[PDB]
């Protein structure tokens, strides 16, 4: 420990840079929420989207289905005579997650404002080939690389609060009536691309590739068993009265 620093530089650099990066992240998040815009939806695209969801749930949950009704559904989807997939046919800079440019600009402005500065030292032993990285404005060759400048301080700061931001924020799930509309919107946003023919053919062949295994036949497992949960359960239902 050396290089006795002033107490009036830590109160005008560290707290300002921390608050700046925190509120810059908050601004970015809230502005991203604000700029989000809904997408126009045609009733037809919603229609094939829901048809695809129906085929998917048929593929996923098909064990608990009467065999006759299962082949009825499979034939209706396939129907080699007419078929619904076969005839019903429709007709047919480099912005990449822009979050690096703002942080780079902020770091560049912060480094431009502070020319010759010593913010804090890092306990971690660092090599001398990272000295041009870290100081960038201090004319010292005998000094160690532990003492970093404000640029690296802010660069480590933006990653320090990356997981902290999610602590304050979170996910939301409400509006049961609007939940269905959200599901249709997202599902048809999945089904935007105009490749209906190949998707229909792929689903048509995939549905044939599925087999049937009635999971309802295995009933004998339950018959030879013990029913004791239904009274520990029944004991804890009695105490509650009627409001």
């Amino acid at each position: 420990p050396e290089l006795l620093l002033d107490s009036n530089i830590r109160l005008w650099v560290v707290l300002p840079i921390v608050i700046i990066t925190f509120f810059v992240g908050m601004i970015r998040h809230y502005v991203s929420i604000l700029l989000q815009s809904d997408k126009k939806l045609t009733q037809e695209q919603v229609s094939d989207s829901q048809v695809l969801i129906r085929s998917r749930v048929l593929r996923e949950n098909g064990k608990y289905i009467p065999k006759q009704s299962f082949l009825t559904r499979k034939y209706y989807f396939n129907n080699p005579e007419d078929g619904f997939f076969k005839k019903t046919k429709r007709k047919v800079m480099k912005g990449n997650v822009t979050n690096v440019l703002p942080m780079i600009l902020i770091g560049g402005w912060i480094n431009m404002t502070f020319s010759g500065f010593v913010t804090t030292k890092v306990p971690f032993p660092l090599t001398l080939r990272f000295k041009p990285m870290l100081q960038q404005g201090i004319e010292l060759l005998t000094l160690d690389a532990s003492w970093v400048s404000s640029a690296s301080w802010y660069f480590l700061n933006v990653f320090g609060l990356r997981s902290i931001y999610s602590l304050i924020l979170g996910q939301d799930n409400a509006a049961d009536q609007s939940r269905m509309m959200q599901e249709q919107m997202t599902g048809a946003a999945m089904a935007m691309p105009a490749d209906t023919n190949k998707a229909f053919k792929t689903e048509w062949e995939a549905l044939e590739l599925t087999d049937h295994q009635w999971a309802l036949d295995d009933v004998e497992e339950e018959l030879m068993a013990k029913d004791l949960h239904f009274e520990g359960m029944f004991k804890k239902e009695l105490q509650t009265s009627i409001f």
Partner: protein, 148 residues
């Protein structure tokens, strides 16, 4: 028991219980209205986002129970905040169908459909209107068409 129930209670518990009622979508229009105007006159301070759904649920229950005065009282408040909203229009059409002159609620539904092509609620309400107006066969036909 009314005053006794009104004594040992807090507004937070009332709001949580109504949220649970909405989650279970039970029929307790008597009790929903009974607690509805109480939190409207006792707290009437905060939770505007909650109080909007609160108003809608209260008037839904009042349409069923006995009271159109509170229904219009909540309708005017809902219209004050949101000038153009299709949910308020659907609720108003439901109340109109409840009172009289079903055909006016009908053309209201066609205007709603003309504005927003994708409106399942209006079509469902029209289907329910023709369920009770005419025979059930026609309602089944329209429900099958919408389900297509």
């Amino acid at each position: 028991a009314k005053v006794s129930e009104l004594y040992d209670v807090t507004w937070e518990e009332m709001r949580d219980k109504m949220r649970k009622w909405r989650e279970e979508n039970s029929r307790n229009s008597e009790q929903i209205v009974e607690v509805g105007e109480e939190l409207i006159n006792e707290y009437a301070s905060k939770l505007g986002d909650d109080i909007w759904i609160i108003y809608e649920q209260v008037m839904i229950a009042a349409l069923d129970y006995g009271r159109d005065d509170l229904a219009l009282f909540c309708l005017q408040e809902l219209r004050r905040q949101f000038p153009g909203s299709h949910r308020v229009k659907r609720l108003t059409g439901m109340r109109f169908e409840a009172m009289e002159r079903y055909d006016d609620a009908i053309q209201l539904y066609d205007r709603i459909l003309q504005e927003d092509p994708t409106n399942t609620a209006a079509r469902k309400r029209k289907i329910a209107i023709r369920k009770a107006q005419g025979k059930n066969v026609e309602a089944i036909r329209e429900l099958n068409e919408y389900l297509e």
